[PDB]
Amino acid sequence: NFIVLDKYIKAEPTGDSYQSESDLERELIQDLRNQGYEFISVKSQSAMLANVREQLQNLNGVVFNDSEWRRFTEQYLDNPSDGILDKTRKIHIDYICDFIFDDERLENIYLIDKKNLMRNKVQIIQQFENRYDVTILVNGLPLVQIELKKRGVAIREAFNQIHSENSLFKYLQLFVISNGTDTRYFANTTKRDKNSFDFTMNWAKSDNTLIKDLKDFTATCFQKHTLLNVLVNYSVFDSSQTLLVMRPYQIAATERILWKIKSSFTAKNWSKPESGGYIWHTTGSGKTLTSFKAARLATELDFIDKVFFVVDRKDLDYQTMKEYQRFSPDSVNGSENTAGLKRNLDKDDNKIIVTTIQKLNNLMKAESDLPVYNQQVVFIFDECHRSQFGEAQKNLKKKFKRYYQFGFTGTPIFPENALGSETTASVFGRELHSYVITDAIRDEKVLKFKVDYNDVRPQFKSLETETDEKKLSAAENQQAFLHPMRIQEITQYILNNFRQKTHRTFPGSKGFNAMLAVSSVDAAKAYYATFKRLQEEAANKSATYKPLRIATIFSFAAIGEISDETFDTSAMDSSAKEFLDAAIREYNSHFKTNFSTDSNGFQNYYRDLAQRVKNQDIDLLIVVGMFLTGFDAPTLNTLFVDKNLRYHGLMQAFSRTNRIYDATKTFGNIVTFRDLERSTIDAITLFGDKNTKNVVLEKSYTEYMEGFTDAATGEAKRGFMTVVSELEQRFPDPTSIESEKEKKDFVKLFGEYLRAENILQNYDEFATLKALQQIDLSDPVAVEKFKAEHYVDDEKFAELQTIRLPADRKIQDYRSAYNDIRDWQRTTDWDDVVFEVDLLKS
Ligand SMILES: Nc1ncnc2c1ncn2[C@@H]1O[C@H](COP(=O)(O)OP(=O)(O)OP(=O)(O)O)[C@@H](O)[C@H]1O
Ligand SMILES: [Mg+2]
After folding, report:
1. Residues 37 and 19 in one domain
2. For residue 410, how many C-alpha atoms fall within 13 Å in the half-sphere facing its CB?
């Protein structure tokens, strides 16, 4: 009885009126009632509390007197000081009130019965108090809100508009918005960085096919058994108090894992590859959230004795270390130590064990008669890299007698890229669920890549295109790849363009931040020094220079694979260690921290550093191989690459930028100073087919300027230049926006202008062209200063003067008129009109 279906037959429309919001509401209420939801009339919170009282008394087999019920209400159900986050805490964690009655007896009052899910009462009400809405009540509590809109209302624009009193609606867990054609759901959270339209979701089948229209969505997502499982078992409330409602592919993998455990155990078919399986969920789609959730659910199987959740120490960061601290405290870090692991093994009244693959492998090497070897064990592995996982499989196959193991990866091991390691299929067995990169990009759940070799260094181009590895390793020195000029030109390019790439030029726009991945410890030292020197230079030239805050971290290591670096700082050579030492000193003075480079300090520095790159206390992080495979930073959008990446390491590193955020983060920028074009196509193609690169890789500057057709859709996209031309041709101004119609058409057109400029801000050709508009062509020093900073010659310089762009004045005239029209939105038809709210606020 899976809740993400393998097969689904589309319902038929009634033939009745299905245009207005009250049309959608009629059929939704009717459909929900056919599915066992009792409709009640509720006109007040007083009537809501009364209904809650009836449902919780039924559920819990107990009758409150009135004084008790008022007390229950003021102190647990409906505390006046509770906010949304407090009700989510109560739904997901604190759902049992141990209540003391007037006669002093003690009873557990459940808000929700989680073990007997179907015992919960589900009800529907319509909106009471202009807005058409239906609310699903679970034991009288409002947990879902369905916002209904007219057909042909832009669902996105409606979302922007709506995202005490009455306080019971703080309990809402889930939103659904629908114009009948499209239906999206999203979590009720106060975290604004999770509140953008990018975080709404379509329901779907296990093959990932969308289920969009409200009638089908009603009959699938809104089956009591579906919706209640989504609400209770497939929504995560983490240690940072963020509610995340899982996407269908995440749920689809999870339930298929659990069902596979049970049928294997019932078949007494354990400890073979046909006992478990793997999940192919593409990089950045939620493997770490999902696999961890599936491990937590697995502990609720009464016949399993211990569930191992295994991560790679390479992949740890602040948020996930905070998470794991709650379940396996002081045990999930970067050290080789197993004391914490073996202590959590001995904890009774506990089934989940989080650990790293380095630790699990160490313990299994040294220990031989652990009780857990003969128990019923689930293994859930979250992207464990090739070399350490290989030795761990040997001892696991050797020593666990009754296990069911599962793996999540975004970059499987096929015959073609095996050389050395066992294929993913041979280790884990069947592919239980797949959600691949073209799946995720079509669903807009990860971001595309803009990948460009920055070929502006002729003296060094020969090296930066070298392909023999022997030669490439031999060029990691100051005569070649670490030539001070090359390091300077590259570092200068990054300082001249960081704000352009991260969307920080036109303030007070927050923007994004970036990483720089390099080839070696010496490379990191040269770059950190050059940045330092070049920024002290800029501080003297201009006194209005605003510096970037730069940091680095690395230790010592040891195709496709990114080298594993140890957390044992005593492994490094004296020079690397004293450099990393001096960097932490500067880091300490700035952030008023006090980390050292002993093991404990380095580990805490690593943990602080991840936090500050994620929240942009750091502008640019320089690494060799750390934070390249698991680090989750939605507001990081640019990876500067001076490194030879291939195959799965390529996919992982680039994907540091691939997190969706809002409409300002159109894709991740990958700026490379070695030519990685062949490697990018080879790596994309290895994890898809020959067409996959056309979905993953962004179009050229000429395409966004002049227009193209998205082959994935058939959607013609107008070019910037066509838009700009239409703006002048049809709106040379103020009299052009006289009539309502002309106002609507202008908003539509200027919205495309804003989408196109924001895309084009990531193209060096466009930044160069914008820069030229701010120049005295008579002034020859500033003409020469622009040529050298944008790498244009006298020929290229000639051509760009001919490209006519609209003046800053006419743009800000467009901008404020656009705002007028937006704020006025309090014959002609405004429903389909999406204002570009995020791009504005930028
Ligand atoms: N269902 C969801 N709802 C809301 N947010 C989500 C959901 N799934 C993933 N995210 C967000 O997307 C980001 C990436 O998730 P996560 O790091 O678990 O992915 P991953 O696949 O392990 O990535 P990597 O391949 O880089 O290790 C996180 O910030 C996460 O909170
Ligand atoms: Mg991960």
Report:
1. yes
2. 26
Strands 141-148 and 174-178: parallel
Minimum-distance ligand 1 atom for the alpha carbon of 290: 18
* Residues in CB range of 309: below 8 A, 6 or more apart: 291, 292, 295, 352, 353, 354, 355, 380, 382
Cα angle 718, 724, 727 (rounded to 5 degrees) comes to 105
- Measured distance CA(371)–CA(740) in Å, rounded: 76
> Resolution to 1 decimal, in Å?
2.6
Tell me if 659 CB under 6 Å of ligand 1. Answer: yes
Please state the atom number of ligand 1 nearest to the C-alpha of residue 292: 18
Ligand 2 ion: nearby residues, β-carbon < 5 Å: 287-288, 630
Domain that holds residue 15: 1-43+117-244
Residue 88, domain CATH = 3.90.640.50
Task: Report the distance separating Cα 246 and Cα 299, nearest Å.
Answer: 19
CA of 358 to the centre of ligand 1 (A): 23
* Cα-to-centroid distance, 604 and ligand 2 (Å): 20
Render 813-827 in DSSP notation, one character per residue: HHHHHHHHHHHH---
What is the length of the chain?
Answer: 842
Triad 837, 841, 842: Cα angle to 5°? 115
Q: How far is the CA of 445 from the centre of ligand 1 (A)?
A: 9
**775 and 743 share one domain:** no
Same domain, 631 and 676: yes
Rounded Cα gap, residues 292 and 286, in angstroms: 10
Q: Are residues 12 and 71 in the same domain?
A: no
